[PDB]
Design a protein around this ligand. Structure first.
Ligand code: WKV
Length: 460
């Protein structure tokens, strides 16, 4: 029975509006409704992994597991195994997998982050799950961010708190937050970004939605504008939105947007918005293709419509050679030549690099680089040809060309990371000096760049 080199992943996000679901929710798991939908011919084909994020979920974990498992069994005739479930208040994540994957899955982690302080601590935050699927690390974040059209900055703050403090994945990757720990990271939920148009335009917006003309609304979507200005979700992807705004509907129909201010809304307008979103970030040159992104039309118990996204995702096998794991393979080496870090920092410490990768027995610390002044004010840290030669556990190019090296640049004075990035080993050539590049981030914000050349030796 061969190990897969691809799997499909279903991501669901649904703000349930503290109401039980209707008896049938299969349209959600089938990616049927509005937007980029799944072909009817695929309906019986199970996804490998289903990840369900809910917000304002009134159900017990047991109640929801029973509905989800029975839904998937009805669709697929497959009884799914529960990988993980984690709830913070009314924010929940469920991970289900086909039974054939039970022994491919390991290192399961769950965590949550509560956002805000005093007033603003009590119902918003995020839950997450990570695990290994054979040689591939998968991370999943369901976040319910701050509501309200005039709080996009708070939402951006909530995002940074979640990515700093959510403790998922390999704890040995100590300089790296969740935006660097996974082959594939899926971040979804009620992110609560709004269409930023005047309140007086509510009926105009509704008109536009009825005509399925979203262009003039998407050009005011706060998540798209904030992402374009690098204020939030830097280096994440989102599929094009081709479905109607998923909020705020009158319950028990989809015919009406309920946008007017009410005591129940704290006298706030809720203009139709794409509150409910799925984004991802995968390591460079790893296969990931969005195959659906849309909303259901027939699940009407909430003032939100469910959102689905599906993905093809490249995975690798758990590789064993004569040598590694448990030793190095002297026929492999990774050389970093003529490298330099360009940092935005104004500080004047020396810096060193750490190289982290599952292709190494353990992380490698470099010598300190040489600081120079860049022409436009910047710090340039030169490493020359001084960088340690990295000794991979396995030299087989079928393994090594699929790997990645995480890089942290750290202050010698404080040992704190000033920037984190990732370099793919999926090179055009071996035994050949080739350009490499990564942006560097810290707390998910751009702090600089790392570039130079690499020379990869494999056994072939
Ligand atoms: C090692 O642990 C697991 C491996 C595979 C699957 Br599938 C699920 C688990 C644990 N999850 C639960 C609910 O026991």
């Amino acid at each position: 029975q061969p190990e897969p080199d691809m799997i499909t992943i279903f991501i669901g996000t649904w703000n349930m509006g503290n109401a039980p679901p209707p008896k049938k929710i299969t349209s959600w798991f089938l990616s049927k409704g509005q937007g980029k939908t799944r072909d009817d011919s695929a309906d019986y084909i199970p996804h490998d992994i289903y990840v369900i994020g809910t917000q304002e979920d009134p159900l017990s974990e047991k109640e929801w597991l029973e509905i989800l498992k029975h839904s998937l069994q009805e669709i697929t005739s497959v009884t799914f195994k529960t990988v993980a479930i984690h709830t913070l208040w009314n924010i929940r994540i469920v991970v289900l997998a086909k039974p054939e994957h039970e022994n491919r899955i390991s290192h399961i982690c769950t965590d949550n982050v509560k956002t805000g302080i005093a007033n603003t601590l009590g119902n918003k935050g995020a839950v997450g799950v990570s695990f290994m699927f054979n040689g591939t690390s998968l991370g999943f974040v369901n976040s319910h961010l701050t509501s309200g059209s005039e709080k996009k900055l708070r939402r951006n703050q909530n995002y940074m708190n979640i990515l700093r403090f959510l403790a998922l994945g390999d704890k040995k990757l100590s300089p790296f937050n969740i935006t660097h720990r996974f082959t594939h990271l899926f971040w979804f939920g009620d992110l609560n970004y709004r269409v930023d148009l005047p309140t007086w335009e509510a009926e105009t917006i509704i008109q536009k939605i009825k005509q399925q003309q979203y262009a003039d609304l998407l050009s005011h979507d706060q998540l798209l504008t904030e992402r374009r200005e690098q204020k939030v979700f830097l280096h994440f992807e989102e599929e094009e939105i081709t479905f109607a705004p998923t909020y705020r509907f009158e319950r028990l129909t989809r015919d009406k947007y309920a946008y007017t201010k009410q005591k129940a809304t704290g006298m706030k307008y809720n203009l139709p918005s794409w509150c409910d979103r799925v984004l991802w970030k995968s390591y460079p040159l790893v296969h990931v293709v969005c195959q659906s992104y849309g909303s259901t039309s027939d699940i009407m118990t909430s003032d939100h419509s469910p959102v689905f996204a599906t993905f093809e995702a490249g995975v690798t096998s758990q590789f064993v050679s004569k040598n590694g794991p448990g030793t190095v393979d002297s026929q492999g080496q990774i050389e970093f030549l003529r490298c330099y870090a360009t940092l935005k920092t104004k500080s004047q410490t020396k810096f060193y690099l750490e190289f982290h990768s599952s292709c190494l027995e353990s992380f490698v610390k470099s010598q300190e680089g040489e600081n120079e002044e860049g022409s436009e004010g910047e710090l340039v840290v030169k490493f020359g040809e001084t960088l340690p030669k990295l000794k991979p556990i396995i030299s087989d190019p079928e393994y090594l060309l699929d790997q990645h090296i995480l890089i942290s640049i750290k202050s010698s004075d404080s040992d704190e990371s000033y920037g984190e990035g990732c370099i793919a080993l999926r090179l055009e050539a071996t035994e050949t000096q080739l350009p490499i590049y990564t942006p560097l981030t810290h707390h998910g914000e751009l702090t600089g760049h790392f570039q130079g050349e690499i020379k990869l030796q494999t056994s072939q």
